[PDB]
Amino acid sequence: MTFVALYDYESRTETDLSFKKGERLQIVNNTEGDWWLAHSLTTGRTGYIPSNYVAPS
| Interface positions with a second copy (CB under 8 A) | 2-7, 9, 11-20, 22-28, 30, 32, 34-43, 45-51, 53-57
Q: How far is CA 5 from the centre of its chain?
A: 15
Measuring CA to CA, how many Å separate 36 from each of 20, 46, 50? Answer: 23, 11, 7
Provide the minimum distance between the beta carbon of 11 and a second copy in the complex, in angstroms, as a whole number. 7
Provide the minimum distance between the beta carbon of 14 and a second copy in the complex, in angstroms, as a whole number. 6
Provide the minimum distance between the beta carbon of 52 and a second copy in the complex, in angstroms, as a whole number. 8
CA distance 57 to 13: 31
